[PDB]
Structure 1
Amino acid sequence: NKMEAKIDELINNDPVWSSQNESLISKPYNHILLKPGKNFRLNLIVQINRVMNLPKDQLAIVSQIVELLHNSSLLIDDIEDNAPLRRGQTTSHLIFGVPSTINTANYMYFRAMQLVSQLTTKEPLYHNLITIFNEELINLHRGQGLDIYWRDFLPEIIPTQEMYLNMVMNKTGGLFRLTLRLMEALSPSGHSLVPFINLLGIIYQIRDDYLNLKDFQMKGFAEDITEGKLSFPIVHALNFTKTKGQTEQHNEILRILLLRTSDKDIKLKLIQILEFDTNSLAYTKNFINQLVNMIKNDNENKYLDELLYIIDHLSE
């Protein structure tokens, strides 16, 4: 009876959750917050707003939603990629464990979703905001899924440049489009900037792939090699070697990716194969320059001051 009295009180009430329970499970997340880059993601949202003109308090909420998705996605990504470092610091899952980091990151996806309701009281608009949120998160996971499948089951599938670009459109375009589409839907204020934001996302991803090797060849650890990632330079090298009949090189690239090695000489041998044998580094540098010129040479404002600053710091 005292037992049943306690049970009856428990089941007729909401679940008890304290501020202390809250702090305990936020550990994986608080750790990644110490990392910088939040001012650059905020700087993009700000330039875009000069076109969208959302009031500042609404923009603030869009910002928070996007920071949560972004940080949660990096927590998961580092587990998925087995990364030891992120922004010069030890990775959350190595500190608090994969179990807590996975649960916390997923918890934060749902807190971000909860924030959408603070953007309007209008039921029609709300529905659209949630649909955008849902769609681009579906897109993000589809892209990530392919990137991870290709890498983990290599050489089952050797992606082409086309396939790589479609995966980026889902993966990276997912979060870029999500921010921009929420803003365009909230705008109280010409043509959509989705194509432009897609382009920015592609430049962002390929430049990330490139610098990861270029910083190490010349700063960084070419950690993408250790991870075995089918990066833009690797995709070009794998397809170049196949096409030119460089069987031994094609096979050595695969073998090195499959070692998941941290040996600096082995990583440097692969990067020099990309520099002199396949010319994938030059191919990638020029491909990046051509994408950037599609904008810098966009006089007819077909895609489009502060535009450029953003494109040269797109690394942060």
Structure 2
Amino acid sequence: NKMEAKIDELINNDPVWSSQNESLISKPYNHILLKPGKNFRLNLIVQINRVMNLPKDQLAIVSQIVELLHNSSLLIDDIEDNAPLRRGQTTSHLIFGVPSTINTANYMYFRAMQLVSQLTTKEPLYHNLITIFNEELINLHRGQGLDIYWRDFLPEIIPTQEMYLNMVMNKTGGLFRLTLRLMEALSPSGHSLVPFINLLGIIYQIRDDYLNLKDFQFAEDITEGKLSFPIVHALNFTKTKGQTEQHNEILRILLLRTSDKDIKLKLIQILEFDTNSLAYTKNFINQLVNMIKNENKYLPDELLYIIDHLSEL
């Protein structure tokens, strides 16, 4: 009767969970916290709030949700990309293992979800906030799913520039739009800034793809076999011009998942001198950036600063 009695108590109570348990499963998350970038994400949010005017308490919660989602998305991204390093340090899954890291990252999506209820007591607003949360997380996964599928099943699908851009609108635009949409729905306070934030997302991703190869010229995107903006331009350029051998060598090198520096450098120089994809990309970025530097259709000083430090987000 004492087993039954204890089983009785167990099932008539909420599940037990200690602060000790909480710390043990937060390990992969606490480790990525030590990586920099927080202050640049906060700066962007603050500058945007000069337009939305959320009371600092509310802005702090938006900031927390955003940090939880971004950090979790990165923990998962490095597992999906088998990345050994993130901002100069060891990637969490290599320390605590893929199983704990997946679970913690996913746990943190739900903690982020929970914070949304701290933003307002108004029930209709709450529903809109959760819908915004739900929609953009759905968008992030769609884009991420395409990116991974193209890479892991290459050469089944060779995406065009148009397909890449739609994938980025989902994959990268997701968090930019989530943050901005939450702020605009909460604003006590011009046209919507979504177009502008999408453009920031697209510049962010292509620059990320570009710098990954240009700072090397560890070109880790080549090791991952990522269909990056420069790679998509080169694969299409070579098909188009009938450079059969080059098209095939690009695919062959991506499929190797190699860490050999010279092989990576051979590929980068093919995009440099043979397809001119690096110059094409650099110019594509300058053009998107000029779309803001040149009205007030997209925009509502600090902006230019943000754009030059976009890479640090």
User: So what's the TM-score if we normalise by structure 1?
Assistant: 0.98
Cα separation, 2, equivalents of 1:18 and 1:103: 18
Total equivalences in the alignment: 311
CA offset digits 1:145-164 (Å, max 9, x no partner): 00000000000000000000
**TM-fit CA distance, 1:141:** 0.1
Cα separation, 2, equivalents of 1:208 and 1:86: 13
**TM-fit CA distance, 1:175:** 0.5
Cα separation, 1, equivalents of 2:162 and 2:49: 32
**TM-fit CA distance, 1:71:** 0.1
**Corresponding residue for residue 134 of structure 1:** 134
SS in structure 1 at match of 2:14 = coil
Pick from 214, 223, 226: which aligns with 1:226? 223
CA offset digits 1:181-219 (Å, max 9, x no partner): 0000000001000000000000000000000000000xx
**TM-fit CA distance, 1:29:** 0.2
Cα separation, 1, equivalents of 2:47 and 2:174: 19
RMSD: 0.4
Cα separation, 2, equivalents of 1:64 and 1:89: 23
Cα separation, 1, equivalents of 2:297 and 2:191: 9
**TM-fit CA distance, 1:224:** 0.2
Aligned pair 1:279/2:276, yes or no?
yes
Cα separation, 1, equivalents of 2:288 and 2:131: 30
CA offset digits 1:64-97 (Å, max 9, x no partner): 0000000000000000000000111110000000
CA offset digits 1:106-131 (Å, max 9, x no partner): 00000000000000010000000000
SS in structure 2 at match of 1:301 = coil
**TM-fit CA distance, 1:253:** 0.2
**Corresponding residue for residue 308 of structure 1:** 304
**TM-fit CA distance, 1:289:** 0.2
CA offset digits 1:17-43 (Å, max 9, x no partner): 000000000000000000000000000
SS in structure 1 at match of 2:310 = coil
Cα separation, 2, equivalents of 1:98 and 1:211: 27
Cα separation, 1, equivalents of 2:73 and 2:259: 24
Cα separation, 1, equivalents of 2:51 and 2:295: 17
CA offset digits 1:197-245 (Å, max 9, x no partner): 000000000000000000000xxx0000000000000000000000000
SS in structure 1 at match of 2:216 = helix
Cα separation, 2, equivalents of 1:248 and 1:98: 38
Aligned pair 1:178/2:174, yes or no?
no
| Poorly superposed stretches of 4+, deviation over 2 Å | none
SS in structure 2 at match of 1:169 = helix
CA offset digits 1:280-301 (Å, max 9, x no partner): 00000000000000000xx510
Cα separation, 2, equivalents of 1:28 and 1:313: 27
Cα separation, 2, equivalents of 1:235 and 1:21: 45
Cα separation, 2, equivalents of 1:315 and 1:170: 18
Cα separation, 1, equivalents of 2:216 and 2:87: 16
SS in structure 2 at match of 1:302 = coil
Cα separation, 1, equivalents of 2:309 and 2:265: 26
Flag structure 2 segments of 5+ consecutive residues without an equivalent: none
**Corresponding residue for residue 255 of structure 2:** 258
User: So what's the TM-score if we normalise by structure 2?
Assistant: 0.99
Cα separation, 2, equivalents of 1:311 and 1:2: 66
Cα separation, 1, equivalents of 2:205 and 2:232: 13
Cα separation, 2, equivalents of 1:38 and 1:245: 46
Cα separation, 2, equivalents of 1:258 and 1:92: 25
**TM-fit CA distance, 1:261:** 0.3
Cα separation, 1, equivalents of 2:289 and 2:5: 68
**TM-fit CA distance, 1:312:** 0.5
